[PDB]
């Protein structure tokens, strides 16, 4: 599924990521758009073999398991493909666990770059929440 971005700001309210650790609406919504376009099928490989999954690009090194990225962990005890889901519970849950971690949003690497440090508030303006 491929979210509007006002779609996704009221999905990613009603299971609570506003302000969630300090992080208001907007960076949750910029981090999406950069990361995967709000396509919740986008993947990426990266080149030590692990791939990203999902709306927030969500890493099988650490967080999800696909099956093919050996050593790896998978703390969000999830299989990758569920984080392709139309339904972004899932990813939103596991994306939690990830900014509670101790590095905040910066283990997004597209926020870090595009959305930290600009007016995020703009990516929840006109949008009824
Ligand atoms: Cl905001
Ligand atoms: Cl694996
Ligand atoms: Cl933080
Ligand atoms: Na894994």
């Known amino acids: ?20 650790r300090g992080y208001s609406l907007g960076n949750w919504v ?11 099928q986008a993947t990426n490989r990266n080149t ?7 709306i927030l690009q969500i ?3 650490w967080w999800c398991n696909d099956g093919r990225t050996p050593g790896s962990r998978n703390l969000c005890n999830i299989p990758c493909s569920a984080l392709l ?7 939103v849950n596991c994306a939690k666990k990830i900014v509670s971690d101790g590095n905040g949003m910066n283990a997004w690497v597209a926020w ?6 600009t007016d995020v508030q703009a990516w ?3 949008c009824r929440l």
């Open 1 to 20: 599924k491929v979210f509007g971005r006002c779609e996704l700001a009221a999905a990613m309210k009603r299971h609570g990521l506003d302000n969630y």
């Open 59 to 61: 890493n099988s090194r």
């Open 124 to 126: 929840i303006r006109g």
């Open 85 to 91: 889901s139309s339904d972004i519970t899932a990813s």
């Open 112 to 117: 870090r770059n595009r959305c930290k440090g």
């Open 48 to 54: 030590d073999g692990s791939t990203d999954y999902g």
């Open 30 to 40: 910029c981090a999406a758009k950069f990361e995967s376009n709000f396509n919740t």
